[PDB]
């Protein structure tokens, strides 16, 4: 279901996700064994020995639970809930070493190397290397694409400096910051920067003329006096400083 990048492992030093993947493959192998022994409906008493064998493989397990004290219906519901994988706990610093994970792989009919020789889907040929495959238990985030994709095209301007706004609930485009201005000027792009600060966002009599020019097909650069540079001009004129143009 998921094709994850193995390139981010040695730089970010997160080798524990590989241990989690091998333990998840072992737990899923135990779950497929339980699902294979459940869909045949052969017996129940073999599951009471098999899942009990699957519950004691380490040096000393913190809970020495036994399935012999349970009922038939409780073990049947436990196996039915174990059909959708196997719930397996591991402490944050008292977790399982790779020997017990290899024993979990041996008990779930899986090789000791952890990487299973996989077959490709696009070309069908099997790889020369065995592929580490298993369960990571990944989560859906709050930064979804319908909360991240947000564009803006001539709607709900401001009143102070005649500026487009920001945010998706406010329907405003992303800020073209000053570092992007220095990089665009480092390219030497003059006509894009004359649009990005004068006629796309600044001049209210300029962006309307640009819109009317693009609608009638004339893609000609028509600059003018910016409607937020004169904001600074009238601000420093009200401050008590004389300034004018040539």
């Amino acid at each position: 279901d998921i094709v994850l990048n193995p390139l981010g492992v040695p730089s970010r030093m997160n080798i524990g996700q590989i241990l989690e993947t091998h333990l998840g493959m072992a737990a899923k192998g135990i779950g497929d064994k339980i699902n294979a022994m459940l869909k045949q409906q052969q017996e129940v008493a073999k599951l009471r020995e098999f899942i009990q064998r699957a519950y004691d493989l380490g040096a000393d397990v913190r809970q020495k639970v036994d399935l012999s004290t349970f009922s038939d219906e409780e073990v049947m519901r436990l196996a039915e809930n174990l059909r959708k994988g196997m719930p397996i706990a591991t402490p944050v610093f008292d977790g399982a070493k790779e020997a017990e994970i290899k024993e979990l792989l041996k008990l779930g009919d899986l090789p000791t190397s952890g990487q299973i020789r996989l077959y490709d889907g696009r070309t069908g040929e099997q790889f020369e290397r065995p592929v580490t495959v298993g369960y990571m238990y990944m989560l859906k985030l709050n930064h979804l694409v319908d909360d991240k994709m947000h564009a803006r095209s001539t709607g709900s301007y401001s009143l102070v400096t005649q500026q487009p706004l920001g945010g998706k609930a406010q329907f405003g485009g992303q800020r073209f910051g000053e570092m992007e201005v220095w990089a665009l000027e480092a390219y030497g792009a003059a006509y894009t920067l004359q649009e990005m600060l004068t006629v796309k966002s600044d001049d209210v009599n300029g962006r309307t003329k640009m819109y009317k020019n693009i609608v009638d097909g004339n893609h000609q650069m028509e600059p003018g006096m910016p409607e937020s540079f004169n904001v600074l001009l009238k601000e420093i004129r009200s401050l008590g400083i004389n300034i004018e143009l040539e």
Partner: protein, 149 residues
């Protein structure tokens, strides 16, 4: 169900408060989709009460991050639930265990450069089986203010 756990999953749901917590333990009498009625046993029975603790489960309300909160009932009908256990899992829990997401087959391998700089390449079954689909409850208050005109 969370496959790989830590042991903290059996207590975070009961300690969070968003789940149906067992204030008094007993036998399940009647479970609806919006409420759970558990019949309190005689050892935890009070003479000043009725021996019935109905848990009015919160339905699909809005959170502070535009997502859903739904206290889904997870217990079956006619089974004993003791004190301090779970009756209804919350929005991201499953049978008193913290169900943060979903578990599926993951392969640490490159496939056509799609997992280039730690990116995810999904199959069709994450949405064909509706595994990663998500309810999102937003709010849009159409406000009718009174101007001069």
């Amino acid at each position: 169900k969370p496959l790989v756990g830590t042991g903290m999953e059996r207590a975070v749901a009961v300690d969070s408060g968003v789940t149906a917590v067992a204030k008094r333990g007993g036998v399940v009498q009647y479970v609806d989709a919006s409420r759970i009625v558990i019949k309190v046993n005689e050892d935890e029975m009070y003479p000043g009460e009725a021996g019935i603790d109905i848990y009015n489960l919160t339905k699909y309300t809005r959170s502070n991050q535009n997502t859903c909160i739904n206290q889904m009932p997870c217990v079956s009908l006619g089974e004993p639930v003791e004190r301090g256990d779970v009756l209804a899992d919350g929005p991201s829990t499953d049978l008193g265990e913290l169900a943060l997401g979903q578990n599926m087959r993951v392969a640490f391998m490159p496939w056509n450069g799609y997992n280039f700089e730690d990116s995810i390449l999904v199959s069709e079954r994450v949405v064909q089986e509706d595994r990663f689909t998500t309810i999102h409850i937003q709010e849009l208050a159409c406000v009718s203010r009174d101007t001069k005109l």
